[PDB]
Design a protein around this ligand. Structure first.
Ligand SMILES: [Cl-]
Ligand SMILES: [K+]
Length: 168
């Protein structure tokens, strides 16, 4: 539930900064370590955010340029997000933690900029984006929440757990 652009932007920033801050103490040498019962490495964790946040921005970019938007992505389907994630890991996994963090910070700033340029109705009322219709009656802000606030929260838990369990 969000009432304003300011409220949404502030919640994204709050959850994003707590998430990113967890990577400060992680060694580059350990970025690919798979730890027991933790589904992703630090590098995979970041690549997942880079994937969805950039995909969100790309949906909007395609639609306002007048293009059809295949969601989640061309060649990928909602019933096979695992394959989509694999494309994320492959795409962003060739970069360091430092590099992935910088990219993600830039992508989140683009989200701030996007929210600012939306009209109130475009952000908060359904029926304004074709790409948002992918889930019936969801306004854009919901799509933004579930790809920023929500995963920055959940995957902060995952990366903290990774740090609790990673071997010396
Ligand atoms: Cl994980
Ligand atoms: K990895």
């Amino acid at each position: 539930e969000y009432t304003s652009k300011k409220e949404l932007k502030e919640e994204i920033e709050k959850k994003y900064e707590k998430y990113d801050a967890e990577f400060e103490t992680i060694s580059e040498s350990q970025k690919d370590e798979k730890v027991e019962t933790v589904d992703r490495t630090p590098s995979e964790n970041l690549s997942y955010q880079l994937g969805w946040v950039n995909l969100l921005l790309e949906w909007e970019a395609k639609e306002i340029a007048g293009y059809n938007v295949e969601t989640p992505a061309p060649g990928y389907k909602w019933n096979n997000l695992g394959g989509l994630y694999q494309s994320f890991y492959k795409k962003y996994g060739i970069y360091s933690i430092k590099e992935q963090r910088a990219k993600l910070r830039e992508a989140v700033n683009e989200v701030y900029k996007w929210i600012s340029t939306l009209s109130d109705d475009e952000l908060f009322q359904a029926g304004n984006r074709k790409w948002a219709t992918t889930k019936a009656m969801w306004p854009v802000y919901k799509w933004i929440h579930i790809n920023t606030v929500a995963p920055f929260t959940n995957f902060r838990g995952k990366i903290r757990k990774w740090k609790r369990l990673v071997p010396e």
